[PDB]
Design a binder for this molecule. Structure first.
Ligand code: MGP
Ligand code: Z5D
Length: 184
């Protein structure tokens, strides 16, 4: 009977790389949820009925935030980016992505989870990517707290840093090695 409210409401987005297009016109809102039961119903189903493919990306964002730099909650923000080796086991990708989602819907960064906008997985033959997007790239204390807890929660090796990129820098990159406002 009684569903267990997620403290907050969430939307899953899909993106299939059409690039003739306007980037934003390729998003797709898949469905929304705000209970523990509906999260797992969606996660279980999407995993079994989907297939990993290059260019086909997924985003989970708080209700009302579109997963794009242009959104008001994202324009001043940035992301903690995890870049996977080409060589990683699919098992790693699965675990990292679910652990990321659980950090989102479980509000794992305590008072700083209010800075969290969503998370994105990019499926790329060059190397898969997972990131948590936050709303203000100049909030050093919130951004660095989120980064540290996130890196630990995924059990990443302490010797390799992960980087926080501002969306403003990402969009204007040229080397296509975007610089990191912060590392952890
Ligand atoms: C997240 N994002 C990505 N793009 C565009 O999609 C392209 C691919 O951005 P990408 O995030 O898909 O990285 P990819 O691994 O495919 O390549 P990378 O650029 O070397 O990191 C980018 O060059 C952007 O032009 C975006 N374009 C807009 N307008 N808004 C966005 O929020 C946005
Ligand atoms: O073979 C393969 O590529 C398979 C099939 C498969 C089949 C059986 C067992 C395991 C596997 N698997 O992938 O580990 N890909 N499935 C895939 N799921 C996703 C995906 C994307 C987004 C979300 C999500 C769901 C809810 C909320 C937020 C995000 C959940 C999943 C992308 S691709």
């Amino acid at each position: 009977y009684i569903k267990h409210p997620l403290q907050n409401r969430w939307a899953l987005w899909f993106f299939k790389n059409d690039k003739s297009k306007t980037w934003q016109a390729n998003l797709r809102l898949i469905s929304k949820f705000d209970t523990v039961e509906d999260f797992w119903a969606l996660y279980n189903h999407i995993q079994l009925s989907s297939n990993l493919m290059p260019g086909c990306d997924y985003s989970l964002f708080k209700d009302g935030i579109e997963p794009m730099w242009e959104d008001e909650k994202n324009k001043r923000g940035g992301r903690w980016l995890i870049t996977l080796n080409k060589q990683q086991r699919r098992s790693d990708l699965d675990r990292f992505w679910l652990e990321t989602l659980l950090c989102l819907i479980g509000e794992s960064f305590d008072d700083y989870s209010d800075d969290v906008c969503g998370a994105v997985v990019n499926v790329r033959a060059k190397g898969d990517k997972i990131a948590i997007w936050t709303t203000e790239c100049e909030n050093r204390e919130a951004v660095t707290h989120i980064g540290r807890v996130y890196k630990e929660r995924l059990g990443l090796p302490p010797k390799i840093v992960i980087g926080y990129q501002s969306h403003a820098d990402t969009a204007t990159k040229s080397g296509s090695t975007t610089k990191n406002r912060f590392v952890v």
